[PDB]
Structures are given as structure tokens and as C-alpha cells.
Amino acid sequence: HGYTDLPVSRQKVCQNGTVGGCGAIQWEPQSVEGPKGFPASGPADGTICSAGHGSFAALDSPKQPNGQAWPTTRVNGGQSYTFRWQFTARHATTDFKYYVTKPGWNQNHNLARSDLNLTPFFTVPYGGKQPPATLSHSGTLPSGLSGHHVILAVWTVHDTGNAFYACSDVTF
């Protein structure tokens, strides 16, 4: 159980007071768990950011619950960046993978595989080890992007069929 707080994920902006109206997620931003094996398996298109949980469907919407744009973290393409997770349960881990949207992605529907560059821009094989409660690691942000984009962080848990999914809105 955990989420990304750098770049801050939708579940965390719902918990932290930045976005109102998100429903159940606001009490448990750590809980966005779904099947592993993205993109071949894992949550269905349009339910990626909620990991398939109907109770967390606000996270999949292209807008925050009030219809305004999601808040974004400003980032610089091609620059190193600290990606950070906060965990409430530090499970043995297979890997962390980070994906970005493609130029021209559909910003007006729920995020889907067709919006994403499905080769991760940053991968951390983790060898079955247990992360610290706050894990910070450096990766290089993708180049060639401008404007609103989504970074999808996927944490795959060792000796399970599960992964945690965290969509973060960024501006390149």
C-alpha cells in the first residue's frame, strides 16, 4: 500500500485537500491496487488511474470532480527528477515502472493505453526487496513533450498478482 507524492498523484491530491469531491479515496490514497502485468494485463482502459475500483472512479476522470482541470506539477523534460513513493505497507517488491503520455494524447476521456507510451521511460528492478517507508529514486524525465501530460507509476508487488497504480498530472 502506497502512492507517489513526487510528482504528486491524483489519489494524493484528493487526500491532501487540494482537490475536493473525490469520494472514498480521500481517506485511503494508499489503496489503488489492481492486477499486475500492465500493459498486457492489469486494469481495463479507462480505469487505469483507479486500478479498476469503481469506488475510486474519480481518479480516472479527465477533470477533477468539479470539472476544472486537475492540478499539475511543472516539470522539465530531459532533466533528472526524484520520484518518490510513500508507503503504508512496505511489501517485497518486483519493480517500479514509470510511463508517460504521448504527444496528442486524448485529454478529454479517461486515460487509456492508447494515450501512453507503453515503453516505460524509467524502470527500477527491485529484486524482491522491501522498500523503505519513503522511497526516493532518480530518473530522467522524457524529452520531446510539452503541455499537460500524465505520468503513470506502477509498483509491482513480489509473489502476488497485484500492483499499485498512481497517475500524476504534469506540465512539460
Report the interface residues with Cu ion, using CB under 5 A: 1, 89, 159
Contacts of 128 (CB under 8 A, 6+ apart): 92, 93, 94, 158, 159
Q: Which is nearer to Cu ion, 83 or 164 (CB)?
A: 164
Contact in structure between 56 and 106 (CB atoms under 8 Å): no
Question: Cell 510528482 identifies what position?
Answer: 7
Task: Tell the smallest beta-carbon distance from residue 118 to Cu ion (Å).
Answer: 25
Residue type for 142, please? P
Q: Is 63 helix (H, G, I), strand (E, B) or coil?
A: coil
Q: Which is nearer to Cu ion, 92 or 112 (CB)?
A: 92
Q: Which is nearer to Cu ion, 22 or 163 (CB)?
A: 163
Question: Cell 510511463 identifies what position?
Answer: 99
Task: Tell the smallest beta-carbon distance from residue 78 to Cu ion (Å).
Answer: 33
Task: Tell the smallest beta-carbon distance from residue 98 to Cu ion (Å).
Answer: 19
Residue type for 90, please? R
Residue number, nearest CB to Cu ion: 1
Task: Tell the smallest beta-carbon distance from residue 8 to Cu ion (Å).
Answer: 20
Cα angle 118, 120, 123 (rounded to 5 degrees) comes to: 150
Q: Which is nearer to Cu ion, 95 or 169 (CB)?
A: 95
Instruction: Name the helix (H) or strand (E) containing 95.
Output: strand 93-100
Task: Tell the smallest beta-carbon distance from residue 35 to Cu ion (Å).
Answer: 14
CA distance 116 to 111: 8
Q: How many helices (H) and strands (E) does the chain have?
A: 1, 9
Q: Which is nearer to Cu ion, 69 or 89 (CB)?
A: 89
